[PDB]
Amino acid sequence: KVFGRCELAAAMKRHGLDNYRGYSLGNWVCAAKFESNFNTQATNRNTDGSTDYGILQINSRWWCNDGRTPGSRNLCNIPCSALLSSDITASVNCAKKIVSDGNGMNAWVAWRNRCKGTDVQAWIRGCRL
Ligand SMILES: [Cl-]
Ligand SMILES: [Cl-]
Ligand SMILES: [Cl-]
Ligand code: NA
Ligand SMILES: [Rh+3]
Ligand SMILES: [Rh+3]
Ligand SMILES: [Rh+3]
Ligand SMILES: [Rh+3]
Ligand SMILES: [Rh+3]
Ligand SMILES: [Rh+3]
Predict the structure, then answer these.
(1) Which CATH architecture does the domain made up of 1-129 adopt?
(2) Residue 109 CA to ligand 4 centre (angstroms)
(3) Catalytic residue among 7, 18, 48, 52
(4) Torsion of CA 12, 28, 23, 77, to 10 degrees
(5) For the chain, what are the domain ranges?
(6) I want to staple 31 with a disulfide (CB 3.0 to 4.6 A). Which of 12, 72, 111, 126 is the partner?
(7) How far is the CA of 107 from the centre of ligand 3 (A)?
(8) Annotated binding site for substrate
């Protein structure tokens, strides 16, 4: 499913991301924009053989099981395919664990390089939230 910007903002808000670990909703929407272009079905292979899945491009190296990432963990206790669903519940719940692990949103390289320090509020402008 390819979310609209405000549609995704609304779903992220309902699921508790707004100000989660101190990160305003615009941070999460900006991250999703540059990670996946709001596409829940997005996948990308990493150089190390792990794969990133879903709207927030969650990595099989640590967070989910895809059966093809040797030596990896499954800290969110989910198949990576759960992260591709039209329902963002699994991605949000796993994202909450990632952002709590010490590095905050710096875990998402595209957030660090493209969202951090910018006017992220722009990403939720106009939405009925
Ligand atoms: Cl914001
Ligand atoms: Cl594996
Ligand atoms: Cl932080
Ligand atoms: Na894994
Ligand atoms: Rh808000
Ligand atoms: Rh890499
Ligand atoms: Rh399985
Ligand atoms: Rh649901
Ligand atoms: Rh839902
Ligand atoms: Rh502004």
Answers:
(1) Orthogonal Bundle (1.10)
(2) 19
(3) 52
(4) 70
(5) 1-129
(6) 111
(7) 10
(8) 101
Give the separation between CA 53 and CA 16, rounded to whole angstroms: 20
The tokens for 119 are 């006017």
Experimental method: X-ray
Query: Can you say whether the dihedral through the CA atoms of 117, 24, 107, 36 is positive or negative?
Result: negative
Annotated active-site residue 35? The verdict is yes
Instruction: Name the resolution in angstroms.
Output: 1.5
Binding site members: 101
Amino acid occupying residue 81? S
Distances in whole angstroms, Cα of residue 54 to Cα of each of 23, 69, 81: 20, 17, 8
Which residue bears the tokens 């395919």? 81
Task: Based on the residue annotation, tell me whether 52 is a catalytic residue of this protein.
Answer: yes
What tokens were used for 12?
Answer: 């992220």
